[PDB]
RNA sequence: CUGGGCUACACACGUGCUACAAUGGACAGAACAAAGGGCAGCGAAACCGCGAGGUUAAGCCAAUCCCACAAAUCUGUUCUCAGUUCGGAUCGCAGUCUGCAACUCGACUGCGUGAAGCUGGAAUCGCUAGUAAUCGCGGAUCAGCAUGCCGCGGUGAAUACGU
RNA sequence: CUGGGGCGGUCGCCUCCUAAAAGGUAACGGAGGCGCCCAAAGGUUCCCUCAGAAUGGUUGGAAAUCAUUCGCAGAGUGUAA
RNA sequence: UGGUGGCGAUAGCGAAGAGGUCACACCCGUUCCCAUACCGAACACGGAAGUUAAGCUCUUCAGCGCCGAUGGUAGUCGGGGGUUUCCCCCUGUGAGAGUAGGACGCCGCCAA
């Protein structure tokens, strides 16, 4: 009877009001987080091209944790994907907050990217 | 409250405490309360943890608030629906139980 | 957890066997209860809205929220602000001690309590319940305020139709007027 | 749950004049209660309690 | 001749009753009268019914017997200032008695209920001592029907400066 | 200023219409308002979405509040288009 | 099959089935990090018992909303005529509605 908003449903109404603030690229592709219930991802995307430049996720058979879906050991992907684009060298990227709060352990993904090098 | 009646006395006389509820009065409170044996006794609020429940059994076996209002509902409402010679003065406004209509009239009409 | 262990052991499969659903989790429940004062001091001239705080927190220790008037009224008091009535929209496990204080404890402290509300459902599953007395709830002190208000309590179900919800509440065991 | 706003809830011991007891939780360590569902006439089946409704109606008046 | 009405009822009055209360209210015990009626009548005692009264029945044609026990008052418990343990209507259920029959329309009793009233405006009244005021009793009508009417006794005041 | 003048009314600022699909574009033509207000009714971060309607309820009322659906906007957006 | 994009609702409302190991989900708890004008509904956190129910995907429908013509007309530039508050031709443009019809999506990138 009580109709609820899904945590994916209204989240992309909070995500697009970040998408009206940033340009995707500027030799600096945008970088979003996807916080599911089980395991949490990271892609490096840029408008105009829509090219996912380099990516990985917590779902990765290489470099498992193996606690898999908990605190900042699951932000090794925040450490990995910044090290993954480090061989592309690109860049001091733009960071999407998705539709989540930049709070930790969503912040801790992008925390792991900065001492992995990338300036944001 | 109380442990015996609904909205019972508290720190008051035992016969008047039995004279609280709409149906429990002075004569019957002295009668069935006299069967329980209080007489005020203890005159404020202390009858018993097992004596006040004795007013729950001896005090609980009789009635009646909703049964008094229901018997009145079947009387002014019973004769108010089954006739009558008690209905036209039961709600008509004039003296029903006997009086002068130019009288004091402090039951129904007044001034 | 005495109501909470009641339906988590028997009641939810009892509706499944009464009439079917797929997915045994698909069963209506207790969702949320919104207690209301609605008072507004009648009419703002008390001035104690906040008298309704002390009267409400001992139904359950949930901190309440005074409901602010969201409209200006031409026939009474007042324009917006100056809130009208308190509110606890309680949930969870404190939910399942509020109702154990209702059925076998405080709902018979309604004086002429027999059974009630044949039609007070909102048509599609909510259960409305008006309350006219306040010696009802147990941790209310008779030594305290001694002033008379009224309440609503709005029990919310999960069922699409109140068909399924009314039969749920009878498996809960709710005394209705029949 | 805000700290210091919500009163502590020790395990309650509900009781009654009929000796019925119930284990719940409350601010008070013990809670005597005048009436329980196991004692109230409505919840307890259809006890005569005091009525004996309809005795007598609408008529039964005869004496010889 | 039957039934009804004289008893109705938005309202204003007239005369009285009972109250608003601690000099009071409830109980227990004790004490004090006078007067009149009673045969188509009074009714003793006894038992029954909380109760009002019922039953039978001695006695009295009455300075003998009955109505009859007076009540305010005195001695203890207690209520403690409040719409109440005050006061009492209204009204409900339940009984008695009277009658051809108590619904319009007799009273009394039980249980319950407990209005309004916390000494009443301008104004108005009666009162010179066994008086005011107050507490009870009997009787004419009358099968029943008194807070009226007519008598009877009990407690026992203040003031009259003066025109 | 003026359909002679006088009397009446207006003199300046913002919005609409007349305005002829850029933009202006007149009359004593048709409507409103403006000589302020907000120390926040400003800036930013981060949330959320209305009005009305129905259904049922506490003195609850044609309507204050409270819950479930409707409801692209019939709500608000200081003050007026 | 999920995630992120780009394109005018031809992408949508609505009706109906089907899927869950993996993924997205609900779900479970609140000691933590952090939230409620209150509250683990949400927001945050760590976990895996239960689930296709809802979300979400696929598939059918054209009830609604949408797209959308051709022809023909209203209007109209430019001449020319009049019976001149308006009307008539000629040249060229051409609406709006309706309608024939389309459509309840394509095209990516990454991840399994």
Curated annotation (Swiss-Prot), chain A:
The lineage of its organism: Bacteria, Bacillati, Bacillota, Bacilli, Bacillales. Belongs to the universal ribosomal protein uL18 family. GO terms for biological process: rRNA processing; translation. This is Large ribosomal subunit protein uL18. It comes from the Bacteria. The keyword Transmembrane helix does not apply. GO terms for molecular function: 5S rRNA binding; structural constituent of ribosome. GO terms for cellular component: cytosolic large ribosomal subunit. InterPro entries: Ribosomal_uL18_bac-type, Ribosomal_uL18_bac/euk. It comes from Bacillus subtilis (strain 168). The keyword Translocase does not apply. This is one of the proteins that bind and probably mediate the attachment of the 5S RNA into the large ribosomal subunit, where it forms part of the central protuberance. Required for correct processing of both the 5' and 3' ends of 5S rRNA precursor, which is does in conjunction with ribonuclease M5 (RNase M5, rnmV). Possibly folds the 5S rRNA precursor into the correct conformation, thus acting as a chaperone. Coiled coil: none annotated. Keywords: Chaperone, Ribonucleoprotein, Ribosomal protein, RNA-binding, rRNA processing, rRNA-binding.
UniProtKB/Swiss-Prot annotation, chain B:
The gene is rpsM. Part of the 30S ribosomal subunit. Forms a loose heterodimer with protein S19. Forms two bridges to the 50S subunit in the 70S ribosome. Located at the top of the head of the 30S subunit, it contacts several helices of the 16S rRNA. In the 70S ribosome it contacts the 23S rRNA (bridge B1a) and protein L5 of the 50S subunit (bridge B1b), connecting the 2 subunits; these bridges are implicated in subunit movement. Contacts the tRNAs in the A and P-sites. Belongs to the universal ribosomal protein uS13 family. Keywords: Ribonucleoprotein, Ribosomal protein, RNA-binding, rRNA-binding, tRNA-binding. One of its GO terms (cellular component) is cytosol. One of its GO terms (molecular function) is tRNA binding. This is Small ribosomal subunit protein uS13. One of its GO terms (biological process) is translation. It comes from the Bacteria. Residues 92-111 are annotated as: Disordered.
From Swiss-Prot, chain C:
Signal peptide: none annotated. InterPro entries: Ribosomal_uL5 (IPR002132), Ribosomal_uL5_bac-type (IPR020930), Ribosomal_uL5_C (IPR031309), Ribosomal_uL5_CS (IPR020929), Ribosomal_uL5_dom_sf (IPR022803), Ribosomal_uL5_N (IPR031310). GO terms for cellular component: cytosolic large ribosomal subunit. Keywords: Ribonucleoprotein, Ribosomal protein, RNA-binding, rRNA-binding, tRNA-binding. The keyword tRNA-binding applies. GO terms for molecular function: RNA binding; rRNA binding; structural constituent of ribosome; tRNA binding. One of its GO terms (biological process) is translation. Pfam families: Ribosomal_L5 (PF00281), Ribosomal_L5_C (PF00673). This is one of the proteins that bind and probably mediate the attachment of the 5S RNA into the large ribosomal subunit, where it forms part of the central protuberance. In the 70S ribosome it contacts protein S13 of the 30S subunit (bridge B1b), connecting the 2 subunits; this bridge is implicated in subunit movement. Contacts the P site tRNA; the 5S rRNA and some of its associated proteins might help stabilize positioning of ribosome-bound tRNAs. Part of the 50S ribosomal subunit. Part of the 5S rRNA/L5/L18/L25 subcomplex. Contacts the 5S rRNA and the P site tRNA. Forms a bridge to the 30S subunit in the 70S ribosome. Interacts with VmlR. In stalled ribosomes contacts MutS2. Belongs to the universal ribosomal protein uL5 family. This is Large ribosomal subunit protein uL5. The gene is rplE.
UniProtKB/Swiss-Prot annotation, chain D:
One of its GO terms (molecular function) is metal ion binding. The keyword rRNA-binding applies. The keyword RNA-binding applies. Binds 1 zinc ion per subunit. This zinc stabilizes the protein. Pfam families: Ribosomal_L31 (PF01197). Gene3D superfamilies: Ribosomal protein L31. Zn(2+) binds at residues 16, 18, 36, 39. Induction: Only accumulates during exponential growth. Its cofactor is Zn(2+). Keywords: Metal-binding, Ribonucleoprotein, Ribosomal protein, RNA-binding, rRNA-binding, Zinc. InterPro entries: Ribosomal_bL28/bL31-like_sf, Ribosomal_bL31, Ribosomal_bL31_A, Ribosomal_bL31_sf. GO terms for biological process: translation. Transmembrane segments: none annotated. GO terms for cellular component: ribonucleoprotein complex; ribosome. Belongs to the bacterial ribosomal protein bL31 family. Type A subfamily. Part of the 50S ribosomal subunit during exponential growth. Binds the 23S rRNA. While neither of the L31 paralogs is essential, this protein seems to function as the main L31 protein. Has a lower affinity for 70S ribosomes than the non-zinc-containing paralog L31B (ytiA); is displaced by it to varying extents, even under zinc-replete conditions. This is Large ribosomal subunit protein bL31. It comes from Bacillus subtilis (strain 168). The lineage of its organism: Bacteria, Bacillati, Bacillota, Bacilli, Bacillales.
């Amino acid at each position: 009877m009580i109709t609820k908003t899904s945590k994916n449903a209204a989240r992309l109404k909070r995500h697009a009001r970040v998408r009206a603030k940033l340009s995707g690229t500027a030799e600096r592709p945008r970088l979003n987080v996807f916080r599911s219930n089980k395991h949490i991802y990271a892609q490096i995307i840029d408008d105009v091209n829509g090219v996912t430049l380099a990516s990985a996720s917590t779902l990765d058979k290489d470099l498992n944790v193996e606690s898999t879906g908990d605190t900042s050991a699951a932000t090794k992907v925040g450490e990995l994907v910044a090290k993954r684009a480090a061989e592309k060298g690109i860049s001091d990227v733009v960071f999407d907050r998705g539709g989540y709060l930049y709070h930790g352990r969503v912040k801790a993904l992008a925390d792991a990217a900065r001492e992995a090098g990338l300036k944001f | 409250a109380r442990i015996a009646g609904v909205d019972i006395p508290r720190d008051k006389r035992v016969v008047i405490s039995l004279t609280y509820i709409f149906g429990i009065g002075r004569t019957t409170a002295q009668q069935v309360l006299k069967e329980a044996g209080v007489s005020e006794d203890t005159r404020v609020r202390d009858l018993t943890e097992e004596e006040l429940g004795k007013i729950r059994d001896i005090i609980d076996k009789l009635k009646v608030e909703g049964d008094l209002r229901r018997e009145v509902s079947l009387n002014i409402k019973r004769l108010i629906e089954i006739g009558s010679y008690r209905g036209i003065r039961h709600r008509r406004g004039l003296p029903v139980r006997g009086q002068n209509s130019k009288n004091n009239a402090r039951t129904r009409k007044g001034p | 957890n005495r109501l909470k262990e009641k339906y988590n052991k028997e009641i939810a499969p009892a509706l499944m066997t009464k009439f079917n659903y797929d997915s045994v989790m698909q069963v209506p429940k207790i969702e949320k209860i919104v207690i209301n004062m609605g008072v507004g001091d009648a009419v703002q001239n008390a001035k104690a809205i906040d008298s309704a705080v002390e009267e409400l927190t001992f139904i359950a220790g949930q901190k309440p929220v005074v409901t602010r008037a969201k409209k200006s009224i031409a026939g009474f008091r007042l324009r917006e602000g100056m809130p009208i009535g308190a509110k606890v929209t309680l949930r969870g496990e404190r939910m399942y001690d509020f109702l154990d204080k209702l059925i076998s404890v405080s709902l018979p402290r309604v004086r002429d309590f027999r059974g009630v509300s044949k039609k007070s459902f909102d048509g599609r599953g909510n259960y409305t319940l008006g309350i006219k007395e306040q010696l009802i709830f147990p941790e209310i002190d008779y030594d305290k305020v001694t002033k008379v208000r009224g309440m609503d309590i709005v029990i919310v179900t999960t069922a699409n139709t109140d068909e399924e919800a009314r039969e749920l509440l009878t498996q809960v065991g709710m005394p209705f007027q029949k | 749950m805000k700290a210091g706003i919500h009163p502590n809830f020790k395990k309650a011991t509900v009781k009654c004049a009929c000796g019925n007891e119930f284990e719940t939780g409350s601010v008070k360590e013990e809670v005597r209660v005048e009436i329980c569902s196991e004692c109230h006439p409505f919840y307890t089946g259809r006890q005569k309690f005091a009525s004996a409704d309809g005795r007598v109606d609408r008529f039964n008046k005869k004496y010889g």
